[PDB]
């Protein structure tokens, strides 16, 4: 699957910006906090696992919420509605078989109605102006993974997990583009497992170096170290699974030598 490879990357690189959330958005949200968002995102991971939905779908949802919240005030009491509608749309976009609306009502233990979820769905489509093909940390990762010598599943799964980790903490990751996060996640995965660095083929491809990833890498390396004590555990729980080669069990490195 190339051709194309470069064109698409170039294209996602541009949409990345076009699609980035507002970095400060949470400061402007009277009734909600990064902390509650984390809960939402964590909840969505659980759901993702529950329904066996693509990681991409999870990544799409969070892009939606963050974009939606970048321009719509929401009361804590409705933040979850925004969450499900986001997941529903993500599902409808990405999934071969999206869960039916009822299922999303049901996973809130009936906190909203099919009618609320649908009406929230419209709102979100209105607020995003149907702009749903968002580049994701995951999208960039699957590209980066192609530059591995040779392919390694623990690396692939560990980047996923790490990338997925970042979705939870608006502060700081909200300030880094999906390709940059995917850079940190990828290299951190490769180092941890193999003791290898960010590939020069990827420098050629991305124009990123360890130099440029560093800031994010520093943040990602902390999230990795502080992962077992994080308030939210659904992602580590998820990545205990054999499906993901139990990568959340592998030990974070003590240092990076950067």
């Amino acid at each position: 699957v190339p051709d194309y490879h470069e064109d698409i990357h170039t294209y996602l690189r541009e949409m990345e910006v076009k699609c980035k959330p507002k970095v400060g958005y949470m400061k402007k949200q009277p009734d909600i906090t990064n902390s509650m968002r984390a809960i939402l995102v964590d909840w969505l991971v659980e759901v993702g696992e529950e329904y066996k939905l693509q990681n991409e779908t999870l990544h799409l949802a969070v892009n939606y919420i963050d974009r939606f919240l970048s321009s719509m005030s929401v009361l804590r009491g409705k933040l979850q509605l925004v969450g499900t509608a986001a997941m529903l749309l993500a599902s409808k976009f990405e999934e071969i078989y999206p869960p039916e609306v009822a299922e999303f009502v049901y996973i809130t233990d009936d906190t909203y109605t099919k009618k609320q979820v649908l009406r929230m769905e419209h709102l979100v489509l209105k607020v995003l102006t149907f702009d749903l093909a968002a580049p994701t940390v995951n999208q960039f990762l699957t590209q980066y993974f192609l530059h591995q010598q040779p392919a390694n599943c623990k690396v692939e799964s560990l980047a996923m997990f790490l990338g997925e980790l970042s979705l939870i903490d608006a502060d700081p990751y909200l300030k880094y583009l999906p390709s940059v996060i995917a850079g940190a996640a990828f290299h951190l995965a490769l180092y941890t497992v193999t003791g290898q660095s960010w590939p020069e083929s990827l420098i050629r491809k991305t124009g990123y170096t360890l130099e440029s990833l560093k800031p994010c890498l520093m943040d990602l390396h902390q999230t990795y170290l502080k992962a077992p004590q994080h308030a939210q555990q659904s992602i580590r729980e998820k990545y205990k699974n054999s499906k993901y080669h139990g990568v959340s069990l592998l030990n974070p490195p003590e240092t990076l030598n950067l």
Binding site: M36, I39, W43, R76, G77, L79, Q80, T108, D109, T111
Partner: peptide, 5 residues
């Protein structure tokens, strides 16, 4: 599950 209230 319900998330906040």
């Amino acid at each position: 599950r319900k998330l906040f209230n």
